[PDB]
Design a protein around this ligand. Structure first.
Ligand code: K
Ligand code: MG
Ligand code: MG
Ligand code: MG
Ligand code: MG
Ligand code: MG
Ligand code: MG
Ligand code: MG
Ligand code: MG
Ligand code: MG
Ligand code: MG
Ligand code: MG
Ligand code: MG
Ligand code: MG
Ligand code: MG
Ligand code: MG
Ligand code: MG
Ligand code: NA
Ligand code: NA
Lengths: 227, 197, 66, 139, 144, 122, 54
RNA sequence: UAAGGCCAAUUAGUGAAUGCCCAUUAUUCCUUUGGUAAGGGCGGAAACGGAGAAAGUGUAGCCCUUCCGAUGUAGAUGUGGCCUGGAGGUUAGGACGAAGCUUAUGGCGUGAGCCUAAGAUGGACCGGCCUCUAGUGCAGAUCUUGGUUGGCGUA
RNA sequence: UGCAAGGCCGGAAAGAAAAGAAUUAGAGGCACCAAGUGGGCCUUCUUCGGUAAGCGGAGCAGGCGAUGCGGAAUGAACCGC
RNA sequence: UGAAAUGAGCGGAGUAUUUGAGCUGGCACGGGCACGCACUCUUCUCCGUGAUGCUCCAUGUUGGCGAUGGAAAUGGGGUGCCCCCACCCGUCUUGAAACACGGACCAAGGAGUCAAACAGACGCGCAAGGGAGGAGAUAUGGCCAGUACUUCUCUCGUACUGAAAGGGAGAUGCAAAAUGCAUCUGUGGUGUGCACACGUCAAAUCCGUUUGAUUUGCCCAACACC
């Protein structure tokens, strides 16, 4: 009976340790969320003031070029050339209405230009990033696709003091921080539903009244109907 | 659908269970599956993996080879430690080319009668895996060994003997028959003995 | 009756992929090289093997001492 | 020398006690409390074993093999004949004195035997009541 | 046993694994080793080099008994000495005597390191074997 | 005796899979055969043809082999077999073999009534 | 297709198999135990006949 | 005063992202099956709602939880996958009715098939399980042999 | 005491910064045994012969053959899947 | 339908906490600050139930029908009908519903077999050795054409190479002999390389240990160069 007694004794301490760890993680997540919200608001206000100062003297303010793009696949798997097939596989878009986040730098842009008839992409907003993470976000755990349900599994997956909560993931993705690749590589590709209300024309570019190609900031209205 | 072109080419062919009909082999597999699952040692995992292989993939070892490798390990040992236990998942055979050996402890699946006699007469000890699991349940202070596979006639026959650079033996029952055109310069041509890469 | 085409051949060749070349450091035989340099290198290698044997004996003796 | 593990490996797939009918595997073994064909419940080949049986007049018997006469078939099994008024907890205690891993099934079996004895009494009364009819042959 | 063959698995498959287009016909390549120089040339040359041609002198009435000549090496001599004499053997003393032609050997070859010194009686011996055994402390005696 | 209750039985399909075109030739049995003809519309899966069996029609494992009364059938041939079911009598019901005669059926029925073992055809 | 096999020489090109048109040329040993028994029986009888000569 | 041809909308200069309909596609839920699958439990806690609890390739899967794939001619392979005649073992049945035969006789199984019921059928043999063995599974070959049949009460 | 080659003893190592400064449903290599196939055809963009052809011959890719399902009233190969 | 309800939602405790908006006191931003970086209105806050439960199944409210019958109900089976869907099977062929061949119905029969040589994969015995065959001997004189026993031979292998006469394979040290000499507990060397041993690093942990990475030693199997 001593084996049973010792096992029970250790189980009690394990329970109390789990509760204490949960309580600590909650406070850390709270503080980080507050910090990020204040940072975003301050950034927007500073940009507004810079634009006003330029306009008052009649100059112009150049916006920073976008750093993040959101890309979704809009065609099925049929009659695809080997080069396009390879690029779509490397972007992890193997099924219609799969979506990912990528860095918007020179190698990525030249890869994206080669598969334009197959994709729709643009520049996401903070609300879009939050919605995708909170509602459609899954992690690669042990090889499996596991839905996000608490901050503890995020912390266990990433094992990094800079990624412990969903708001940390959101911040890294949205601002293209130092751990952009770590966070995005750690997730399963997003699997979305068809856009409610329909599309316009799969076979034409967005500029010609169709759907494929770069539609800039207007990708957010598109994705709000798919998430 | 999902584009998964050629994903079946990543699957690997591995053995999960034994084809053997030996009940004692089954008992050993049961014990070492338990140990490999419930212990952290790498020794138990390797031993469990080797117990499931086929007969041809568990080649027998020689007593003289065991002695040589044990000596090479021993010359750099602090002389205050005991020598490791030699462990072979397979058969141990005797060697008439080596008369004098030291005293060793050897664990194996099967011993030759002459090999058992030699080990005991040198002052050593023969062991079964069921005693080894009691003595060293994690595999501490062991020397895991394998027998030799190259040197088999079947391996020496593999491949075409008529292409340049090859030295495989042909399948032929009459040794004097295939010794002519294709093997001598004075005949039409001779298969080249060497080829780069 | 005598047809020729290359239509499906690249597709066949890419199923098990085009394998990359063997690395430079493997299968690096010298047979067929310029003879005098080869003959000198052989003598150097023989001396090196003798030195390796002596070094092992010295290490064994040192360990036995301490 | 020859252990229970080896014997189970030898007999698992083919035995006179294994009844495999219509896809289902049961056991004929008279030293089996469950009727399941598993190693734990095979009383004929375990070194120690115990089984719960009925007796005449609503009594419960426990038969025990204790592991000292396993080479003598006529002394292997001994009895613990007990009166009708025997608690199921007592039968379970007696069985667990030999094998701790059979206590629960022995408890349930003792209770089931008691219920069977009651039911047999009732149905026998009903049948002997109904039999008030003329018959043409006896014995 | 017939119940393990592939025909049992093929009952119901009309073609039995030989195809619809090219069928299972009688002898589509010729019989036996036909065509070894014409339409099976590649197989013959790639897997059996040397098959066609002539080589060497003839020898009309070969008898193998006068050519009988088995060999045994120096490092295998302990196969012929019983275990009681082998341990007693020592250089400079009394040595076991091995008769090769009674154990089925004619020549003694000199491969390896001898383990138990002895006196060997043989019909033939190689020069290195003779030198090695003399250095180890035995001897060779010629016999017939 | 009452059987132990389970989830509700579903039965993905209730029709049988019958051989193609067996209704037109009296010598063809209805038992299923796989069509292997090159132009067969059943094999090619046209919209209005008969279906073929496959792994997707399989039954729920928690309710496989359970009869409408809630028991699983076990075949029995004599009185002594009834003792195998006395402990698991909420799970299995006995089915008396067809060739058992009336003389022995009487004894089997009497004993099963005494022991409270359900008989499917008693 | 032939692969890498030994070149066969099985020598079975005469009418050795008995069938509807050929008598065949075959020898089986199905009487071997009976002939063994018969030889031993004859030896014992002969010994009894020539007793006591060896 | 299009139900035509070019252009443009979404309930209309009111004041704010999607008029409507239809897939073996997408998202999601339930069940099956297979994995290069991923975790956990299996010294009967004690007492006395119910039962069970096997160290395990494969089953009526040892038991739970989780994730991903599933079409296919020629062709390969697997299957405690199905069926037929005979042999070695083991366990049963039968004149209170064996084999064979009949069916708006249901039940079980994805299926090959298995089992029960009734015969107002029959009259003497035969079922399950583990091994062994083969002259071992039919819709078609201008297939073989026997028997029927529309044309026809016609020419 | 230079050069060539093979080794031994030491050092350094943003393990590859910043400048748009990669990505991966990214485990590398090595064998053995064996089947079917060796009549193709259609389309996109290049084209050679031919007055032209639902004609003959080629290059690159995708298809049908081996495949249904949802559309173009109907159609092996078009559109979607 | 509460047989472990984890809840901002079920419970206990108080009335405050801290989110924004207005308005407040070094550096940044522009040629003053629209209010970036650091130190009055507006909302509810803190605390709690481990599994001595490994698995499965058993728990509300109100009516209708069913009180032992030629009952009620659910499922299965049969036949007709309605709306929708739907080209004739096997075969050769790039292409068959084809104006391409075979096709009246039923029963029973009907097609990868046996032998011999070689090879690979898998099971079993023994191992530098393995194994006969033919035959004999005695239990043995329907059982008994089986089973039990056997020498000394034969065969495959432990050694290859040359057309042939023929010849015939260890290591280290000294040394240079066209048969040198001495020792014999031993990988011929180098690179890559399981497990084990010796230390280090990172992550988690009633927190004593795991899960990975890595230095050094010896490196088994194996591959590459000598
Ligand atoms: K069914
Ligand atoms: Mg549209
Ligand atoms: Mg297009
Ligand atoms: Mg097929
Ligand atoms: Mg062919
Ligand atoms: Mg052809
Ligand atoms: Mg000549
Ligand atoms: Mg080939
Ligand atoms: Mg004739
Ligand atoms: Mg599964
Ligand atoms: Mg399939
Ligand atoms: Mg037949
Ligand atoms: Mg028929
Ligand atoms: Mg074809
Ligand atoms: Mg298609
Ligand atoms: Mg057709
Ligand atoms: Mg050889
Ligand atoms: Na060798
Ligand atoms: Na037969």
């Amino acid at each position: 009976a001593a084996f049973k007694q010792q096992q029970t004794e250790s189980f009690k301490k394990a329970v109390v340790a789990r509760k204490a760890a949960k309580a600590a993680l909650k406070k850390t997540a709270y503080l980080r969320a507050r910090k990020y919200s204040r940072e975003y608001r301050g950034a927007e206000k500073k940009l507004v003031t810079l634009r006003r100062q330029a306009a008052s003297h009649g100059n112009y303010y150049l916006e920073a070029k976008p750093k993040v793009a959101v890309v979704t696949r809009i065609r099925g798997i049929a009659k695809v050339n080997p080069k396009q097939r390879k690029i779509l596989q490397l972007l992890r878009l193997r099924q219609i209405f799969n979506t990912v986040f990528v860095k918007m730098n020179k190698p990525m842009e030249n890869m994206l230009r080669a598969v334009e008839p197959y994709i729709a992409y643009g520049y996401p907003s903070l609300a879009t990033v939050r919605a995708m993470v909170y509602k459609r976000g899954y992690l690669k755990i042990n090889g499996q696709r596991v839905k996000i349900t608490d901050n503890q599994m995020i912390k266990d997956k990433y094992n990094n003091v800079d990624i412990v909560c969903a708001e940390d993931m959101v911040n890294q993705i949205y601002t293209c921080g130092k751990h952009f690749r770590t966070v995005t590589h750690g997730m399963w590709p997003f699997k979305l539903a068809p856009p409610a209300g329909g599309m316009r024309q799969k076979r034409r570019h967005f500029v010609e009244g169709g759907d494929y190609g770069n539609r800039d900031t207007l990708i957010n209205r598109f994705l709000a109907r798919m998430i | 659908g999902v584009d998964l072109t050629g994903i079946s080419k990543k699957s690997r062919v591995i053995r999960h269970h034994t084809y053997s009909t030996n009940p004692y082999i089954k008992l050993l597999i049961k014990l070492y599956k338990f140990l490999a699952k419930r212990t952290s040692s790498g020794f138990n995992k390797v031993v469990y993996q080797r117990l499931i292989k086929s007969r041809s993939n568990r080649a027998p070892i020689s007593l003289s080879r065991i002695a040589v490798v044990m000596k090479r390990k021993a010359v750099f040992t602090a002389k205050s430690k005991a020598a490791p236990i030699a462990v072979v998942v397979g058969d141990v055979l005797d060697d008439v080319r080596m008369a004098r050996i030291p005293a060793m402890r050897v664990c194996a699946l099967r011993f030759s009668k002459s090999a058992r006699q030699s080990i005991v007469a040198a002052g050593g000890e023969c062991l079964t895996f069921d005693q080894l699991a009691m003595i060293a349940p994690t595999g501490k202070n062991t020397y895991l060994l394998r027998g030799r596979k190259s040197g088999r006639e079947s391996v020496r026959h593999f491949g075409a003997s008529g292409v340049p650079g090859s030295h495989s033996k042909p399948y032929a029952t009459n040794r004097g028959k295939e010794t002519k055109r294709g093997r001598r310069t004075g005949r039409s041509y001779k298969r080249k003995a060497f080829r780069h890469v | 009756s005598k047809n020729h085409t290359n239509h499906n051949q690249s597709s066949k060749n890419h199923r098990n992929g085009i394998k990359g070349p063997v690395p430079l450091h493997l299968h690096n035989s010298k047979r067929g090289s310029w003879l005098p340099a080869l003959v000198n290198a052989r003598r150097v290698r023989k001396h090196n093997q003798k030195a390796a044997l002596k070094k092992r004996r010295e290490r064994i003796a040192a360990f036995a001492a301490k | 020398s020859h252990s229970v593990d080896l014997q189970w490996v030898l007999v698992r797939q083919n035995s006179r006690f294994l009844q495999k009918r219509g896809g289902i595997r049961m056991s004929n073994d008279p030293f089996n409390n469950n009727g399941n064909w598993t190693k734990r419940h095979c009383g004929f080949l375990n070194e120690k074993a115990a089984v719960v049986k009925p007796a005449k007049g609503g009594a419960i018997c426990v038969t025990v093999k204790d592991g000292s006469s396993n080479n003598k078939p006529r002394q292997t099994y001994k009895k613990t004949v007990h009166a009708a008024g025997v608690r199921a907890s007592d039968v379970s205690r007696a069985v667990a004195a030999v094998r701790p891993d059979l206590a629960d099934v022995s408890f349930r079996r003792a209770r089931r035997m008691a219920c069977i004895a009651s039911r047999t009494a009732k149905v026998a009364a009903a049948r002997k009541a109904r039999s008030e009819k003329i018959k043409f042959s006896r014995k | 046993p017939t119940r393990f063959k592939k025909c049992r698995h093929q009952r119901g498959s009309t073609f039995c694994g030989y195809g619809r287009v090219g069928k299972h016909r009688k002898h589509e390549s010729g019989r036996g080793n036909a065509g070894g120089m014409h339409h099976h040339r590649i197989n013959f040359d790639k897997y059996h080099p040397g098959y066609f041609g002539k080589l060497g002198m003839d020898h009309y009435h070969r008898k193998k008994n006068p050519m009988w000549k088995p060999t045994i090496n120096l490092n295998n001599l302990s196969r012929l000495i019983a275990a009681e004499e082998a341990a007693k053997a020592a250089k400079g003393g009394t040595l076991p005597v091995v008769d090769l032609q009674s154990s089925g050997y004619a020549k003694l070859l000199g491969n390896g390191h001898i383990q138990v010194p002895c006196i060997v009686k043989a019909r033939y011996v190689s020069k290195l074997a003779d030198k090695k055994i003399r250095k180890a402390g035995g001897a060779v005696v010629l016999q017939a | 005796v009452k059987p132990t209750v389970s989830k509700a039985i579903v039965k993905k399909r209730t029709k049988r899979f019958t051989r193609h075109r067996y209704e037109l030739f009296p010598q063809l049995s209805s038992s299923w055969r796989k069509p292997r003809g090159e132009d067969s519309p059943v094999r090619r899966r046209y919209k209005g043809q008969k279906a073929m069996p496959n792994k997707g029609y399989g039954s729920d494992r928690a309710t496989k082999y359970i009869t409408p009364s809630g028991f699983r059938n076990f075949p029995i041939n004599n009185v002594e077999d009834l003792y195998m079911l006395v402990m698991q009598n909420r799970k299995y019901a006995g089915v008396i073999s067809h060739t058992v005669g009336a003389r022995k059926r009487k004894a089997i029925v009497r004993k099963a009534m005494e022991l409270d073992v359900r008989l499917a055809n008693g | 297709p032939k692969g890498n096999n030994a070149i066969p020489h099985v020598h079975q090109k005469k009418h050795w198999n008995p069938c509807s048109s050929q008598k065949g040329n075959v020898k089986v040993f199905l009487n071997q135990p009976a002939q063994k028994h018969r030889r031993r029986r004859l030896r014992l009888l002969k010994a009894k006949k020539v007793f006591p000569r060896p």
